[PDB]
Design a protein around this nucleic acid. Structure first.
Ligand code: MG
Ligand code: MG
Ligand code: MG
Ligand code: MG
Ligand code: MG
Ligand code: MG
Ligand code: MG
Ligand code: MG
Ligand code: MG
Ligand code: MG
Ligand code: MG
Ligand code: MG
Ligand code: MG
Ligand code: MG
Ligand code: MG
Ligand code: MG
Ligand code: MG
Ligand code: MG
Ligand code: MG
Ligand code: MG
Ligand code: MG
Ligand code: MG
Ligand code: MG
Ligand code: MG
Ligand code: MG
Ligand code: MG
Ligand code: MG
Ligand code: MG
Ligand code: MG
Ligand code: MG
Ligand code: MG
Ligand code: MG
Ligand code: MG
Ligand code: MG
Ligand code: MG
Ligand code: MG
Ligand code: MG
Ligand code: MG
Ligand code: MG
Ligand code: MG
Ligand code: MG
Ligand code: MG
Ligand code: MG
Ligand code: MG
Ligand code: MG
Ligand code: MG
Ligand code: MG
Ligand code: MG
Ligand code: MG
Ligand code: MG
Ligand code: MG
Ligand code: MG
Ligand code: MG
Ligand code: MG
Ligand code: MG
Ligand code: MG
Ligand code: MG
Ligand code: MG
Ligand code: MG
Ligand code: MG
Ligand code: MG
Ligand code: MG
Ligand code: MG
Ligand code: MG
Ligand code: MG
Ligand code: MG
Ligand code: MG
Ligand code: MG
Ligand code: MG
Ligand code: MG
Ligand code: MG
Ligand code: MG
Ligand code: MG
Ligand code: MG
Ligand code: MG
Ligand code: MG
Ligand code: MG
Ligand code: MG
Ligand code: MG
Ligand code: MG
Ligand code: MG
Ligand code: MG
Lengths: 209, 56, 119, 123, 65, 114
RNA sequence: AGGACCGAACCGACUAAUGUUGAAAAAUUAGCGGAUGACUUGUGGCUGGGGGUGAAAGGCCAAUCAAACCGGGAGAUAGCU
RNA sequence: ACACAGGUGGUCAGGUAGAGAAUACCAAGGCGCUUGAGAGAACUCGGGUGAAGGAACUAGGCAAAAUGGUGCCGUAACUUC
RNA sequence: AAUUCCUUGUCGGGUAAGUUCCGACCUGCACGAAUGGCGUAAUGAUGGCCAGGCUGUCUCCACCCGAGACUCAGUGAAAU
RNA sequence: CGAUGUCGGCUCAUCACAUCCUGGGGCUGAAGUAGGUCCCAAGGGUAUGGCUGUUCGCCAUUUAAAGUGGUACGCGAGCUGGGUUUAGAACGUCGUGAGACAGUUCGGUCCCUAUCUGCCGUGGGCGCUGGAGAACUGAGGGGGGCUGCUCCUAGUACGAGAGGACCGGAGUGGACGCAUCACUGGUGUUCGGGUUGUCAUGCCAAUGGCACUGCCCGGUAGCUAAAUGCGGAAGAGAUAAGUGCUGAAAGCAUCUAAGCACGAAACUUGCCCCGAGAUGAGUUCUCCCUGACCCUUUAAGGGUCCUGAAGGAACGUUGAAGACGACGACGUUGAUAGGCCGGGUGUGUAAGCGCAGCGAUGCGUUGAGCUAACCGGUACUAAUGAACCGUGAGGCUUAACCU
C-alpha cells in the first residue's frame, strides 16, 4: 500500500468530549500527483513516483522539468517513490489526495529528524557523566575507556562515540491517526513525528497493523 | 602524544594536498567606471553598480 | 545549538555589545556613514533602524527612550529633528550596507553602513 | 515523585509524623513513585504512643506528592507535602482509620477503596 | 579473596586469604596470616576442628549440667 | 501558523470570563466516578494565568483541609465546566508565586474595587 | 590588663580547582590561620663544610645538602656497560 | 634567561555610603593589559540557574550551597570560676 | 586502646541495615606510672563518628552567560 | 630492570557457556501449586543501600533474575588516589644501638597539544568510458529483541482438604531505546518590572553606567526531561534438545538406514537506518551539445579559428543545516535575511499632566507603556548585467537486428 508525502505544519491538540487532550500533529497532505509508474517489465519492480507542492519556474532545471512535462503534471518540489503492493494500480498523472488515509487507523510517519550538530556522548548515546567533583581532573563529560589492554589492540567497530546526532531519516511507527480532514488537506496523527516545522514527512500506513 | 617514526616527505606532501589556495573566480566589471572589482563589493574608486557611493 | 536564535555574540559579553552598539548607533547618526566590519554592521541594523522608527513621533516620552538607548542628547536631537522627517515615509530599511573589501590589519570583511538619504 | 531517602509526611493517625522511603517497590531499577504507588518506609518520628513505633519497616501508599499528577487533559494537581498512608506488610491495607487532608482520583480502586472512603475531599 | 593490610605488591594482586563457611553449623573462620593460601587454608581447616569440636563438647556439657 | 491557528479557534470556548491573578475564582469541574457525571467545585486564589490561545491555563491555589493544593486547569478544556469569579483581588504582579510560602494572615491579598 | 576576641595592611600557606613543554624551575583564583607579639620588616654586621646554624624536618647555608661550590691530586678507580 | 600574572622598604591618603586604611562607586590622576576578525559544535576552564528528592554521592558533605550586620530579649552540660 | 594477632571479640547504644563510632566486659598475642600513669575546662587550618541547616554532591543531568576549542589573516615553537 | 605504572571504585565496554531469569524439552520418590535434576539455548535482561580502602563478605530491602568467567585477574597518554612502595610522627614489639615489622596509626605532587594504526563523524580528489539533473533496485552492513503484575477462561482440571493450573485472550506497569515541545516544567545574562549603594546626564523629574545579570521576581522563541507519543512484536523458512509416523537391515522390536510430519527468545527473513567505491562501480526517467580546418611520426594523435550547451561552481541574502567544508531555501520574473506594519506573548497600570495628601505616597488618564528569537503581512535596504568551469554527437570487436 502506498503512502502520501505530507509536511509538518506543527502540533496542537484535539479535546475530546471526555476531557482527553490528544496531542496531534497537523500534517498537511496536499495532492500527490504521480509522475512515473514503474513495472516489472521495464523497471524490475512495481512502484509509483509521486510529487507534491509547487516550485518556481526559474528554479526547476531543464532535466528536472522535462521529467514532469512527459507525465503531464505541474513541477512539484520533490520526487518521492512508494512501493506498490499486489493488486494496486495508478496512472501516470493521477492526483492522490488524503482520502486514502480516511479508513486506516495507524500510520508510520517517516521524516528527516532535527540536527543536533556534533554532539558528544552524554547527549548522543546517553553515557553517564563522570563524577563532577571529589577530585576529577578535566574529565567530567568524556566517554572514558574505549577498549581493553593490548589483547584487542583496537577500538571495536560500531563503538559508541561522539559525532553527528540527528539530521538522519527516522521512522515513528503506529501513530494513531486522529483526524483525516480532507476539506483543508490535513492529517492529524496522535504523537510526535520526526523533523522540524515545515519539513517533508512521508506518511505511510502501518506495516505492524 | 608523540610519534615513533619520522613521517616522510610523501606524507607531508599528501597532507598538504588540500592546503592549496583557490584563486578568485572572476572579477566583476563595473558598468560606469568600467574597472574590475570583487563581485558584490564596491570598487577601489568608490563605485558600486554604477553609482558613486563614497568619494575617494 | 543555535536553533531559531538571533543576535550575534561578536566575542563580547552582553554588557559590552550594549555599550558598543550604543556608541556605534550614535556615530552612525552623527556622521551618516561609518565603516565597520561586516558582522558588526549587519547587527547594527537591528539597533539604529529601531532608533529612527522611534523618531517618527516627536514626544517627550520618546525623547526619553531614544536618550535611554543612546545616552547622548546630540544624537537624540538629530534623530527626531533631522532624521525623523527625513525618513518620514520610508517603511523600514533606513540604512544601507556597502561591502568594501578586507581590512589590512586582520583580514576582516569590512563594510560601509550608511543612511539611505545621505547623498 | 518519591525516590529513596525521601522524608514523607504521614496522612493518617496511625502514629507517625515523618517516614522515609527506603525502597520503591514494583520493579527492577525503579526510580520514582507517583501517587497510588507502594513504597517501603521506615518510621523516623512517632507520636508517643500509637499503632506504629519509631524504627518499623513497613509499606505505604503515597497519597499526595509535590510533583503532583497530570490528569488526562493535561491538567496537573500539585500539592505541597509528600504524604503517604501507612499500609501493612502482609495484608497491605491501612493502619490508622482516619485519613488527613485531600487525596486524588488516581488512588481509587478495589485495592484502595478503604482510603477514598475515609478521605475528606477526593480531588 | 585478597588480603587486606600492608606488605606491598604480592599482597596487592594475589589472593592468599581464605574464608571457610562451614554450612550446617554456620561457623566461619577467616584466616589471613601468612603469604601463601596453602599455609592459610590449613590454618583455617585446623580451626574448624577447634570451633566445632570445642562447640559440641561445650554443647554436651550444657545438656550435662 | 495559519492552519494551526484555525484548528484552535474552532475548539476554543466562547465564554471564558475575564479573571486576573489574585481573583478567588471558583471552578466547577466534571468528575466521572464509577459511570456517573457529577460536577465538583474548586475555589481558590489564582496565582498564575498562562495565555496561549487554545493551550491557555490558570493555576489556582487553595488550602484544602489544611494542606495547600495547586491545580493548573487548562482554560479551554472541556472538563472545566464553569469558571466563576467570586472575589476579585489586587496584586501588582503577574504570577503570585510568593503566596506559596505564606499561610494565614500573610496570604491576605486585598480586594480590587474598580 | 592580655604569647586576649572579631578583622584589613602585613606575615603566613589548611583545602580545592586550574596550571604541569605553565604567566611562574611552586604560582593564580575562591575560601584559610596569626594579626601588640615567642610578631613582622628595612639597612649594615657576624658564624664556613666534618664546620655553621637549627622552637629539631637531616631542615637550611645563593633555584645544589646523610656533608656546599670552585680550582687541584686527576686521565682517581670501574673484574661493570 | 622574557616588554614574565611572582618578589621589592619608606612617604602622601580627597567624595558618598561604612566602625574602617574593609568594600561598593567616584575625584586629581593613570590606563584598556602589543595579535586581531568571525563562528556560537564536542569537550575543557571560570561562572549563573534549576523541577521532585536532599548525602541516596563518596575513601570522606571533597567541592559547592548555606550561615553572615547592629540593637535587644535569651542562652545548657561541664567549669581551672 | 595512636597499643588487641585471633577479630567484624561478645553484649548494649545509634541505623531499615553500622568491619567505623560511643558505653561497658577483660580472655592486656605484646598498656602502666616523669623513654611518665590516669583525668582534664579552654584551645586546635588536629583524627573518628552522628544530627539539624543546606544544596547538582547524587537519582540525572538540562539550559544559559563569558575564555579557549573551530574557521580566516599575521608571526610561529616542542618532546620524539 | 637504557621502566611493561600497581588494588579497589567510577566511565565505557566486549566475548565465552560450564545459564541466574525469560524460551524449548526428558526424567521425577512430577496429583495441582511449587519444586528436583539433566539435555538444548547467548536473543535480550541480569539491584539500590548499611559497615570496610576494600575485591570478598555479612546485613537491610527489592527483583522475572540480581549468572559464572575471559579480556595485562579489561579499562590511570580516560578519571579517582582510600589502600599499597618513599621521605615526617607515634604506639605495641624486637634490638645495647642506628633502625626494623604480610603489626597498627595520623599526614603525603598521579605529567603528555595524538605522527601512525584503531574508532566515531564529515569532506576533498578521481573513478564508473560523451556530459548532466534526479529517482531508485539492495549485494552487504548496522540497530532492535528484556519483562512484571492484575483480570477473563476458572475457583475450572487436579485435590481428601489446604490450595490451585497448562493452553489461549484482554489490559496496564517497570527498565531501556527513539522521536518530539502540544501539554506540566527547567533554562531563557538578548524581554518587562521591583530594589540597594553610588555615579553621571546643569538641576527636580526621568533615566543609563557599574557593583557575580548588583541583588532579586516573572518570562517569549529555542534547546530540554521529570513532560507524552511510539517501539520490543505477529507471521514465515530451516533447526537444536525432544516427541513422532511409516519402516526394514534383525519375520519381532525400533523415530532412520530409504521416506514423512512436528519442534525454542537462538539461525535466515519479517521491523527501522545506512547502502552501486557492490571497481562485480548496476537500473530507470529526463535534458543537452548536429562548426569549419590544418599538419604527419595514421592514432582512442597533437594544433588552430569559431563556438560554451544541459548543467554545475563561485559570489551574495541565509537556514528549525552546521566546527570548517557539506546539505537545504532564495537572488528582483524576488518573502532569503534585516527593517517596517498588524497581531501574539511577556511584564503588570510607563512618561507627562491633573488631583487627594504636611509628606512618603495614592488615584484618574491606563491592562497603560515598552515588548528578543514567535505568527501573518509588506520589496523599504541588501540579495547585480555579467563573467568563470563544462563542450561541439560519445572507442574497438562480435551477436541478434535493419531497408
Ligand atoms: Mg542546528
Ligand atoms: Mg556519576
Ligand atoms: Mg592535575
Ligand atoms: Mg573540573
Ligand atoms: Mg593483530
Ligand atoms: Mg621507535
Ligand atoms: Mg592542511
Ligand atoms: Mg532567525
Ligand atoms: Mg576571538
Ligand atoms: Mg554588569
Ligand atoms: Mg614492608
Ligand atoms: Mg598471581
Ligand atoms: Mg592576640
Ligand atoms: Mg589567597
Ligand atoms: Mg584575627
Ligand atoms: Mg664538608
Ligand atoms: Mg637551596
Ligand atoms: Mg664526605
Ligand atoms: Mg693520582
Ligand atoms: Mg676516568
Ligand atoms: Mg606585554
Ligand atoms: Mg579597596
Ligand atoms: Mg596580550
Ligand atoms: Mg560556549
Ligand atoms: Mg548555583
Ligand atoms: Mg534541584
Ligand atoms: Mg524545590
Ligand atoms: Mg553513603
Ligand atoms: Mg555507594
Ligand atoms: Mg568545604
Ligand atoms: Mg559559597
Ligand atoms: Mg598491647
Ligand atoms: Mg554492634
Ligand atoms: Mg562513614
Ligand atoms: Mg570504647
Ligand atoms: Mg611509656
Ligand atoms: Mg619510665
Ligand atoms: Mg605524654
Ligand atoms: Mg592560523
Ligand atoms: Mg622491568
Ligand atoms: Mg639492558
Ligand atoms: Mg625503551
Ligand atoms: Mg549449553
Ligand atoms: Mg524440570
Ligand atoms: Mg551477545
Ligand atoms: Mg550470536
Ligand atoms: Mg531472531
Ligand atoms: Mg548479553
Ligand atoms: Mg550515614
Ligand atoms: Mg574480567
Ligand atoms: Mg589470571
Ligand atoms: Mg586490571
Ligand atoms: Mg586501573
Ligand atoms: Mg591505558
Ligand atoms: Mg599506554
Ligand atoms: Mg592512597
Ligand atoms: Mg586525525
Ligand atoms: Mg566522497
Ligand atoms: Mg542484521
Ligand atoms: Mg515545552
Ligand atoms: Mg512552544
Ligand atoms: Mg516556565
Ligand atoms: Mg531571569
Ligand atoms: Mg520554554
Ligand atoms: Mg542608578
Ligand atoms: Mg533624582
Ligand atoms: Mg562608569
Ligand atoms: Mg521560576
Ligand atoms: Mg518467531
Ligand atoms: Mg512404528
Ligand atoms: Mg515393521
Ligand atoms: Mg518446521
Ligand atoms: Mg519476547
Ligand atoms: Mg509577495
Ligand atoms: Mg522578513
Ligand atoms: Mg497578555
Ligand atoms: Mg520605568
Ligand atoms: Mg501614568
Ligand atoms: Mg484601572
Ligand atoms: Mg500587554
Ligand atoms: Mg513589535
Ligand atoms: Mg516572519
Amino acid at each position: 500500500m502506498i503512502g502520501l508525502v505530507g509536511k509538518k505544519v506543527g502540533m496542537t491538540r484535539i479535546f475530546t468530549e471526555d476531557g482527553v487532550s490528544i496531542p496531534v500533529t497537523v500534517i498537511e497532505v496536499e495532492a500527490n500527483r504521480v509522475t512515473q509508474v514503474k513495472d516489472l517489465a521495464n523497471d524490475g519492480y512495481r512502484a509509483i513516483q509521486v510529487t507534491t507542492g509547487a516550485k518556481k519556474a526559474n528554479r526547476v532545471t531543464k532535466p528536472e522539468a522535462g521529467h514532469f512535462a512527459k507525465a503531464g503534471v505541474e513541477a512539484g518540489r520533490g520526487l518521492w517513490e512508494f512501493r506498490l503492493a499486489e493488486g494496486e494500480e495508478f496512472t501516470v498523472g493521477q492526483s492522490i489526495s488524503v482520502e486514502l488515509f480516511a479508513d486506516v487507523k495507524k500510520v508510520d510517519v517517516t521524516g528527516t529528524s532535527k540536527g543536533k550538530g556534533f554532539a558528544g556522548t552524554v547527549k548522543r548515546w546517553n553515557f553517564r557523566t563522570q563524577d563532577a567533583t571529589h577530585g576529577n581532573s578535566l574529565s567530567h563529560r568524556v566517554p572514558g575507556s574505549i577498549g581493553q589492554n593490548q589483547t584487542p589492540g583496537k577500538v571495536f567497530k560500531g563503538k559508541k562515540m561522539a559525532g553527528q546526532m540527528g539530521n538522519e531519516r527516522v521512522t515513528v511507527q503506529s501513530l494513531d491517526v486522529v483526524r483525516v480532514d480532507a476539506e483543508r488537506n490535513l492529517l492529524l496523527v496522535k504523537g510526535a513525528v520526526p523533523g522540524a516545522t515545515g519539513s517533508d514527512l512521508i506518511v505511510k500506513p502501518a506495516v505492524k497493523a | 602524544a608523540v610519534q615513533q617514526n619520522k613521517p616522510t616527505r610523501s606524507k607531508r606532501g599528501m597532507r598538504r594536498s588540500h592546503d592549496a589556495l583557490t584563486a578568485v573566480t572572476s572579477l566583476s566589471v563595473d558598468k560606469t567606471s568600467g574597472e574590475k572589482h570583487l563581485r558584490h563589493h564596491i570598487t577601489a574608486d568608490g563605485y558600486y553598480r554604477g553609482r558613486k557611493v563614497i568619494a575617494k | 545549538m543555535r536553533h531559531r536564535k538571533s543576535g550575534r555574540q561578536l566575542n563580547r559579553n552582553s554588557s559590552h555589545r550594549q555599550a558598543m552598539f550604543r556608541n556605534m548607533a550614535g556615530s552612525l547618526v552623527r556622521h551618516e556613514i561609518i565603516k565597520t566590519t561586516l558582522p558588526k554592521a549587519k547587527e547594527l541594523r537591528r539597533v539604529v533602524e529601531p532608533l529612527i522608527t522611534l523618531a517618527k513621533t516627536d514626544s517627550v516620552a520618546n525623547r526619553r527612550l531614544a536618550f535611554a538607548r543612546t545616552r547622548d542628547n546630540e544624537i537624540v536631537a538629530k534623530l527626531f529633528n533631522e532624521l525623523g522627517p527625513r525618513f518620514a515615509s520610508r517603511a523600514g530599511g533606513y540604512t544601507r550596507i556597502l561591502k568594501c573589501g578586507f581590512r589590512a590589519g586582520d583580514n576582516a570583511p569590512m563594510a560601509y553602513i550608511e543612511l539611505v538619504d545621505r547623498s | 515523585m518519591i525516590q529513596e531517602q525521601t522524608m514523607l509526611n504521614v496522612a493518617d493517625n496511625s502514629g507517625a509524623r515523618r517516614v522515609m522511603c527506603i525502597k520503591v517497590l514494583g520493579g527492577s531499577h525503579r526510580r520514582y513513585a507517583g501517587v497510588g504507588d507502594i513504597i517501603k518506609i521506615t518510621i523516623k518520628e512517632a507520636i508517643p504512643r500509637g499503632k506504629v513505633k519509631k524504627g518499623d519497616v513497613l509499606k505505604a501508599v503515597v497519597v499526595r506528592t509535590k510533583k503532583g499528577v497530570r490528569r488526562p487533559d493535561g491538567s496537573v494537581i500539585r500539592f505541597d507535602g509528600n504524604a503517604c498512608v501507612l499500609l501493612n506488610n502482609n495484608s497491605e491495607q491501612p493502619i490508622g482509620t482516619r485519613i488527613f487532608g485531600p487525596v486524588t482520583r488516581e488512588l481509587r480502586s478495589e485495592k484502595f477503596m478503604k482510603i477514598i472512603s475515609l478521605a475528606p475531599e477526593v480531588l | 579473596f585478597r588480603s587486606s593490610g600492608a606488605g606491598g605488591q604480592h599482597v596487592n594482586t594475589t589472593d592468599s586469604a581464605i574464608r571457610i563457611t562451614h554450612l550446617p553449623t554456620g561457623i566461619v573462620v577467616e584466616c589471613q596470616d601468612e603469604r601463601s593460601q596453602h599455609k592459610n587454608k590449613a590454618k583455617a581447616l585446623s580451626v574448624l576442628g577447634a570451633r566445632i569440636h570445642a562447640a559440641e563438647m561445650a554443647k554436651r556439657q550444657q545438656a550435662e549440667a | 501558523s495559519n492552519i494551526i491557528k484555525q484548528l484552535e479557534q474552532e475548539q476554543m470556548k466562547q465564554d471564558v470570563p475575564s479573571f486576573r491573578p489574585g481573583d478567588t475564582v471558583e471552578v466547577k469541574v466534571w468528575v466521572v466516578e464509577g459511570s456517573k457525571k457529577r460536577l465538583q467545585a474548586f475555589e481558590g486564589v489564582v496565582i498564575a494565568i498562562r495565555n496561549r490561545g487554545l493551550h491557555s491555563a490558570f493555576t489556582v491555589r487553595k488550602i484544602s483541609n489544611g494542606e495547600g493544593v495547586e491545580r493548573v486547569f487548562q482554560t479551554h478544556s472541556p472538563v472545566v465546566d464553569s469558571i466563576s469569579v467570586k472575589r476579585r483581588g489586587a496584586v501588582r504582579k503577574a504570577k503570585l508565586y510568593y503566596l506559596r510560602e505564606r499561610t494565614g494572615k500573610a496570604a491576605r491579598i486585598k480586594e480590587r474595587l474598580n
